């Protein structure tokens, strides 16, 4: 019943006589599938969970320095060298300084000056590869006919409630069966292998901050980086070398780039971590649904004979359907809820079609809540629910 209200809702109807029905489940999107002599069920892909992530390349966004040293030489005497140029935790640079009597040299020209500083990273970020093999799609299934508004937002007690069930499909087990009680069972043949190439992206992990970025963007970061599991390349990105009157050289780090990245990431898809497994908020999934084993529930029931009471205001949805919350004080339940529209109260001709196919009440106890969906025809009609002299009637109009 969770498709009621979302804008990205598609109503698919297979060809007459065909057996196969294909659907595409998107994040935030909802597909309401119908079939002749089959129940209307809503299936939505809620969360995508990727496991077994491993390190690829880590960028540093905050570094630290210590132990700076210098060395100078006279003009045309060659370049200056220090032993830590072969030390990979140090970053050096040779420059040209004017040398003479005041500096202590006897020649005409520039003298080479080299200065090194110990490299150390204070706060760093990590990019991790997303393997389509270790990838999990979690699907939730929800059926119409029962499960009033109180079941829309309810996540505790899903192991005990038979109407709601959690589905998980990975490339290791592409098939799963939903125990659906009275409505039978639905098949779910999904294609995670041909749904979306998630191989061209990286999963970045900042200081407890997590995003989904292009792999083109990740290798273009002008910052110190190291691959896999430390050997840092491209040290020059974070360090400034100040020239001091062409005699000595000082080294300073640049401020923290944590904020500069957060601004540039404007547009990137965010994610969060459920401990060690990371969940996503984007991506689609193609599935194939079985209509053979999926059955109705209540076609042999008689019409609900006891009276009905409008408990809440009947409202309309984004697609033209009408839902109503009502109270059935009767005890002859389970009973088939009488629902149809009529444009003429004298002919009482059943026009249109029920969206929630064969809405049924389950409990024989009074003061129970129930909601159903209706599809009126274009133009004038009247929502008439119930039968006999205790049926309740409501006004409605289309377009």
């Amino acid at each position, epitope marked *: 019943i969770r498709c009621i209200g979302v804008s990205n809702r598609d109503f698919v109807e297979g060809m007459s006589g065909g057996t196969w029905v294909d659907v595409v489940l998107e994040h935030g999107g909802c597909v309401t599938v119908m079939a002749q002599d089959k129940p209307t069920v809503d299936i939505e892909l809620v969360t995508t969970t990727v496991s077994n992530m491993a390190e690829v390349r880590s960028y540093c966004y905050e570094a630290s320095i210590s132990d700076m040293a210098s060395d100078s030489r006279c003009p045309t005497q060659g370049e200056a060298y220090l032993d830590k140029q072969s030390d990979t935790q140090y970053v050096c640079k040779r420059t040209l300084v004017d040398r003479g009597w005041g500096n202590g040299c006897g020649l005409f020209g520039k003298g080479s000056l080299v200065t090194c500083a110990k490299f150390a990273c204070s706060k760093k970020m990590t990019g991790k590869s997303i393997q389509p093999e270790n990838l999990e799609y979690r699907i939730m299934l929800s059926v119409h006919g029962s499960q009033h508004s109180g079941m829309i937002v309810n996540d505790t007690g899903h192991e005990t409630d038979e109407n709601r069930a959690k589905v998980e499909i990975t490339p290791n087990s592409p098939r799963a069966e939903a125990t659906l*009680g*009275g409505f039978g069972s639905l098949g779910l043949d999904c294609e995670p292998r041909t749904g979306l190439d998630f191989s061209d992206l990286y999963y970045l992990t900042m200081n407890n901050k997590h995003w989904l970025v292009h792999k083109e963007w990740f290798h273009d970061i002008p910052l110190p980086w190291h691959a896999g599991a430390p050997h840092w390349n491209n040290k020059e990105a974070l360090v400034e070398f100040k020239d001091a009157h062409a005699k000595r050289q000082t080294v300073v780090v640049l401020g923290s780039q944590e904020g500069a990245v957060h601004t540039a990431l404007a547009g990137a898809l965010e994610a969060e971590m459920d401990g060690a497994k990371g969940r996503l908020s984007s991506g689609h999934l193609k599935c194939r649904l079985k209509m053979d*084993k999926l059955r109705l529930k209540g076609v*042999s*029931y008689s019409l609900c004979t006891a009276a009905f009471t409008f408990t809440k205001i009947p409202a309309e949805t984004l697609h033209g359907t009408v839902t109503v919350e009502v109270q059935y004080a009767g*005890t*002859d339940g*389970p009973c088939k809820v009488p629902a149809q529209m009529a444009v003429d109260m004298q002919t009482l001709t059943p026009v249109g079609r029920l969206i929630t196919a064969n809405p049924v009440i389950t409990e*024989s*106890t009074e003061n129970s809540k129930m909601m159903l969906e209706l599809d009126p025809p274009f133009g004038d009609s009247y929502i008439v629910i119930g039968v006999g002299e205790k049926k309740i009637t409501h006004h409605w109009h289309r377009s």
Partner: antibody, heavy 120, light 111 residues
């Protein structure tokens, strides 16, 4: 025209296996919660156990100690095994498709019944 | 399992109306269906009422059932001498795995 009919040894030795099968005709074996019931003369009826066509296994808590039930989806049949039978288990056995949720027109359905005795 | 207590012997002359009680617990009648059976000796009980007073073709209109919160009743209008038998009420229970429990049984006898 659906019809249920028991079939099996009407007399067995004690401590043996009480095996009973029941074939369903003109009907889907996937359309019911196929079950077994018993009734000793004088006492009340005792429901033996249920099994669903997918393999959903359900036993009587009072009889789950020595009940093993099987169902063949191909042959449209379902079977029953009872090891370590006592003389007190002399009852009249019926195969029936019980409707766990009462969703089917006509409701439950019953066979003709077989009275089984054990001689020691 | 709270045992269902029923009176053992019910009697009455021809032409009278006799109702049969069937009281259960929250686990069984509060969520499931109620069925009635007429037991004849030496044979299997035959389905009279299933799913709140519907009867398959062949069961007369004279029979009618009714369910309450935790108790069930069967009304026998137009009693006949051919109706002298034991009657059991059976209903599903939503206990450990889902059980089908029968009633204790009541002897009905015409004078």
């Amino acid at each position: 025209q659906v019809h249920l009919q028991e079939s099996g040894p009407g007399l067995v030795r004690p401590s043996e296996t009480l095996s009973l099968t029941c074939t369903v005709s003109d009907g889907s074996i996937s359309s019911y919660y196929w079950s077994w019931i018993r009734q000793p003369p004088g006492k009340g009826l005792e429901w033996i156990g249920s099994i669903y066509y997918t393999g959903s296994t359900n036993y009587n808590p009072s009889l789950k100690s020595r009940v093993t039930m099987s169902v063949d989806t191909s042959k449209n049949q379902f079977s029953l095994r009872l090891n370590s039978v006592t003389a007190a288990d002399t009852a009249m056995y019926y195969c029936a498709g019980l409707d766990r949720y009462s969703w089917n027109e006509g409701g439950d359905h019953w066979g003709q019944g077989i009275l089984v005795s054990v001689s020691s | 399992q709270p045992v269902l207590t029923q009176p053992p012997s019910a009697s009455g002359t021809p032409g009278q109306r006799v109702s049969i009680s069937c009281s259960g617990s929250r686990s069984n009648l509060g969520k499931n269906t109620v069925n009635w059976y007429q037991q004849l000796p030496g044979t299997a009980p035959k389905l009279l009422i299933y799913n709140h007073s519907r009867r398959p073709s062949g069961v007369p209109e004279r029979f009618s059932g009714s369910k309450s919160g935790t108790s069930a009743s069967l009304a026998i209008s137009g009693l006949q001498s051919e109706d002298e038998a034991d009657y059991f009420c059976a209903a599903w229970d939503d206990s450990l795995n889902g059980l089908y429990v029968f009633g204790t049984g009541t002897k009905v006898t015409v004078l």
